[PDB]
Amino acid sequence: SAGFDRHITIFSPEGRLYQVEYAFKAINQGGLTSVAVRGKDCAVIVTQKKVPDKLLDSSTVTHLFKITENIGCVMTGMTADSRSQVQRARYEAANWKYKYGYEIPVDMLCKRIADISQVYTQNAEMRPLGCCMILIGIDEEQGPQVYKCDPAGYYCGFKATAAGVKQTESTSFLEKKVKKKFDWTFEQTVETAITCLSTVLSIDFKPSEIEVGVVTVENPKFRILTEAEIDAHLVALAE
């Protein structure tokens, strides 16, 4: 099923852009997974921080970035491209606020980020960015919001999404979760993200093996739960 492929601008005979297709298969080359769960008034993103060395400066091995004071993003996929996508976003929001007088809603920031990725799929100049972004933000008039922008430029509004090597089970796990409708309390949402990531991998999730981000309607600011809190949260999940 290789197709004409070797060029992103040449359609396969069936109408499938193979080069764009291969983008997603590059997405899981990062070997990690991030899950975002939207609660009643919060959205929690949990990622895998597998630091394969005692020499690595653990402070800078983070997959979580702060796009803006109210919107936080996690990258799943190639670290280099994910970094560029993060950096391109920050300008896109800052241009949004500077241009219209207010902070860019998390809705568009994936749209503009998606729109940038889409033109790289038509004009055979830039090789596509091989990383999916998840934007979480407390949006006024629409509660907490989560979005996942893919290499081909498709973004959607997700009650919960996960991108990474174990996406099929992560989404199946969440799909099992969201349906038995429950009061998604901030504690419930943070717990839900941890369980989702834990069940798929089958890991204990030592305190430092993940990086959970949290955004709540009460304090609409992007925060990364400090290692003490995840342990407290993790112990809460156990009991």
Partner: peptide, 16 residues
């Protein structure tokens, strides 16, 4: 091979 000549081409397994 085929996908290893250009930096902008993604191998079907998904890597540059």
């Amino acid at each position: 091979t085929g996908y290893d000549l250009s930096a902008s081409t993604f191998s079907p397994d998904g890597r540059v």
